[PDB]
Amino acid sequence: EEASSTRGNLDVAKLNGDWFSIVVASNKREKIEENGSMRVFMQHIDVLENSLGFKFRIKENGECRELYLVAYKTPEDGEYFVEYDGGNTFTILKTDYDRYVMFHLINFKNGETFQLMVLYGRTKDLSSDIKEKFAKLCEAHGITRDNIIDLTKTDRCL
Amino acid sequence: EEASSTRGNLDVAKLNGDWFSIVVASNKREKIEENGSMRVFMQHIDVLENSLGFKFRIKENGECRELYLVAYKTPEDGEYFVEYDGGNTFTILKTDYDRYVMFHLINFKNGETFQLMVLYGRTKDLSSDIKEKFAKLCEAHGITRDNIIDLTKTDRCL
Amino acid sequence: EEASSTRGNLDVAKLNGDWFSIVVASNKREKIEENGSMRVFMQHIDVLENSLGFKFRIKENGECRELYLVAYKTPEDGEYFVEYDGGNTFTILKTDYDRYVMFHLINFKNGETFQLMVLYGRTKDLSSDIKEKFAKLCEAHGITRDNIIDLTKTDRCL
Amino acid sequence: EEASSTRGNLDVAKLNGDWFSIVVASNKREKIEENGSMRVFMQHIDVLENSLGFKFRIKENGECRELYLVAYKTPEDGEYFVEYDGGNTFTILKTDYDRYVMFHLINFKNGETFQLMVLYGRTKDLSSDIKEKFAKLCEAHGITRDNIIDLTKTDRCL
Numbered sequence: 001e002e003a004s005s006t007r008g009n010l011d012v013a014k015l016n017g018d019w020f021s022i023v024v025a026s027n028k029r030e031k032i033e034e035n036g037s038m039r040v041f042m043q044h045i046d047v048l049e050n051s052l053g054f055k056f057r058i059k060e061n062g063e064c065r066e067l068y069l070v071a072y073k074t075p076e077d078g079e080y081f082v083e084y085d086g087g088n089t090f091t092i093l094k095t096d097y098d099r100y101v102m103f104h105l106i107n108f109k110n111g112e113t114f115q116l117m118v119l120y121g122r123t124k125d126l127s128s129d130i131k132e133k134f135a136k137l138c139e140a141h142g143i144t145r146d147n148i149i150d151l152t153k154t155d156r157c158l
Numbered sequence: 159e160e161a162s163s164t165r166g167n168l169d170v171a172k173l174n175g176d177w178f179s180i181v182v183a184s185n186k187r188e189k190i191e192e193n194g195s196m197r198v199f200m201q202h203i204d205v206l207e208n209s210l211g212f213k214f215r216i217k218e219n220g221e222c223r224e225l226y227l228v229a230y231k232t233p234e235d236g237e238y239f240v241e242y243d244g245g246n247t248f249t250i251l252k253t254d255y256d257r258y259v260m261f262h263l264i265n266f267k268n269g270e271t272f273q274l275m276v277l278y279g280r281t282k283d284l285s286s287d288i289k290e291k292f293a294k295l296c297e298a299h300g301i302t303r304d305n306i307i308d309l310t311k312t313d314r315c316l
Numbered sequence: 317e318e319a320s321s322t323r324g325n326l327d328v329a330k331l332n333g334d335w336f337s338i339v340v341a342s343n344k345r346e347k348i349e350e351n352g353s354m355r356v357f358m359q360h361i362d363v364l365e366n367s368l369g370f371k372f373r374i375k376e377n378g379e380c381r382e383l384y385l386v387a388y389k390t391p392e393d394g395e396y397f398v399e400y401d402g403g404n405t406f407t408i409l410k411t412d413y414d415r416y417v418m419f420h421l422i423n424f425k426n427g428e429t430f431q432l433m434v435l436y437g438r439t440k441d442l443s444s445d446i447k448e449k450f451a452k453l454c455e456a457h458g459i460t461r462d463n464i465i466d467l468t469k470t471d472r473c474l
Numbered sequence: 475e476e477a478s479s480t481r482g483n484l485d486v487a488k489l490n491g492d493w494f495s496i497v498v499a500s501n502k503r504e505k506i507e508e509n510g511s512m513r514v515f516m517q518h519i520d521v522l523e524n525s526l527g528f529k530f531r532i533k534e535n536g537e538c539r540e541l542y543l544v545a546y547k548t549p550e551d552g553e554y555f556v557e558y559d560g561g562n563t564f565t566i567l568k569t570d571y572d573r574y575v576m577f578h579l580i581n582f583k584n585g586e587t588f589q590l591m592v593l594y595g596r597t598k599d600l601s602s603d604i605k606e607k608f609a610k611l612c613e614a615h616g617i618t619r620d621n622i623i624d625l626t627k628t629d630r631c632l
């Protein structure tokens with residue numbers, strides 16, 4: 001079941017399909033709150049040539065926008081790059097393919113950098129076990145529970 | 159004088175201006191020979207917002223093409239990303255700003271990866287000391303002298 | 317039922333969803349034959365902000381590639397732009413939303429320009445009436461029947 | 475001397491080099507005032523493969539940003555496309571190559587469209603004859619003198 005990019009046994013092809021934003025976390029809370037550049041409502045991941053395509057809605061000024069971004073695979077094992085509100089590097093922390101997928105992102109913009117962790121799921125919501133499991137990883141990565149936000153409880157531009 | 163991105167004391171702003179391709183090296187020689195995707199003839203580097211712009215000519219099918227690429231700064235110290243003939247990551251190995259600049263690049267395309275090192279200079283040519291100094295770094299990075307090519311001796315789409 | 321972009325009554329939002337490549341036509345046949353830059357096997361159209369996203373497979377060197385392109389709406393009524401094997405301009409010639417969609421494209425690359433017409437359908441194939449109807453429009457646009465190719469008869473990277 | 479894209483005798487290659495923003499005009503004044511998406515301070519035009527590269531500074535929130543945009547040539551004679559604050563189409567209205575260049579742009583964003591005309595010059599300023607000549611063309615294109623702004627009189631992120 002489980003796989004990671006840092007383990008090399010990740011079959012990226014199975015990540016293709018529909019995904020929903022379940023939980024976001026970051027010690028740069030500003031970024032994941034109402035109007036934050038990172039409060040994304042995932043819709044679909046496309047597996048392309050040495051790249052991943054993301055279709056998602058983001059609410060700007062109270063209005064949902066339809067955005068699409070292409071992330072390119074880099075030479076650093078399991079790493080992907082994407083230009084969005086700065087230079088972003090991310091990796092697939094863990095996934096079971098048919099339920100959840102956990103991404104760990106590092107942003108860079110004007111000298112400063114911050115981390116981001118997201119729990120995208122195949123269903124509009126996931127079991128607490130998973131959300132709890134995610135929460136634990138966020139803390140392990142230095143993200144306090146105050147900066148973990150459950151999006152299933154709010155509007156996700158649906 | 160000297161500065162590097164891996165030392166953090168790099169003032170990228172001083173890299174702005176005109177640059178010429180002096181020497182290229184790679185153990186994937188195919189890439190740096192006549193018609194190789196990497197046999198680039200640098201012209202100008204633009205320092206932009208969290209990115210670097212490169213204007214260069216590349217000879218395809220005996221015809222010089224005018225190309226421009228934007229590389230984005232990543233969260234990994236001194237690293238930049240650029241999509242060109244695959245996913246590329248590179249860093250400024252060493253520079254004195256007013257004469258030379260040495261770049262170290264790692265390419266990724268369809269599972270395989272190769273290294274590239276270039277000696278871009280502010281004048282159509284550089285002293286042998288420098289070329290020798292570059293050659294030594296290429297070898298230190300596992301690049302044999304047979305794969306170091308002096309472009310000042312050939313046509314550079316000038 | 318029927319709508320066009322040149323009639324202004326086109327509800328682009330209904331073009332969202334899955335589409336298949338049924339028939340391609342162009343008097344630059346080279347472009348639509350085995351290995352041609354235009355022999356695309358459509359998969360999905362995404363309606364985005366003032367743009368359209370296309371997910372399609374194209375067979376290069378006997379190997380199917382997963383590609384995604386974003387086309388931007390232009391000020392010229394019903395026109396969209398997309399950079400792919402040159403500068404492309406296209407319009408939705410006709411559509412009934414639930415079955416077929418006909419696109420007319422004009423490519424530009426290195427001084428020369430050529431036309432392209434495609435019949436993308438919601439099912440792996442369409443009735444002959446439609447294919448015949450398409451064929452007639454291709455001829456009206458100066459495309460001879462020899463340059464109209466039925467892709468349902470060949471491999472479409474499925 | 476004089477040439478236009480609508481006359482087909484335009485040698486785009488001679489537009490390569492440094493350019494300064496002399497005068498901007500638009501009946502969507504909001505766009506060309508302090509903080510307007512169109513109040514651009516041109517720096518350099520790069521002639522590339524079926525495209526034009528623009529390096530310019532734009533003052534956002536009192537801070538000058540370094541931006542670079544690539545515009546692609548389209549099949550419509552003399553027309554170029556560029557995605558910036560919407561879909562843009564533009565043409566070179568008139569130029570003498572060594573002094574001035576006049577661009578006419580049409581923007582499209584969320585159903586609405588507006589025109590823009592710019593007088594980019596090779597020197598920090600141009601003779602009144604030229605500015606007057608430009609002003610006249612702006613009026614001919616329905617742009618009133620109140621919406622013509624002389625940038626040489628203000629800060630141009632220099």
Ligand SMILES: C=C(C)[C@@H]1CC[C@]2(C)O[C@@H]2C1
Pocket residue numbers: 037038040054056069071082084088090103105118
């Ligand atoms: C990392 C991801 C899965 C993508 C790209 C980066 C961002 C801001 O998080 C959104 C979706």
Ligand SMILES: C=C(C)[C@@H]1CC[C@]2(C)O[C@@H]2C1
Pocket residue numbers: 195196198212214227229240242246248261263276
């Ligand atoms: C690395 C660089 C300086 C740029 C981008 C990558 C490539 C292939 O080397 C050319 C110029």
Ligand SMILES: C=C(C)[C@@H]1CC[C@]2(C)O[C@@H]2C1
Pocket residue numbers: 353354356370372385387398400404406419421434
């Ligand atoms: C025109 C389209 C529908 C898209 C974009 C252009 C191209 C080459 O035809 C493919 C798919």
Ligand SMILES: C=C(C)[C@@H]1CC[C@]2(C)O[C@@H]2C1
Pocket residue numbers: 511512514528530543545556558562564577579592
């Ligand atoms: C049209 C141009 C010359 C370029 C691109 C469009 C814009 C907003 O005007 C700036 C510079």
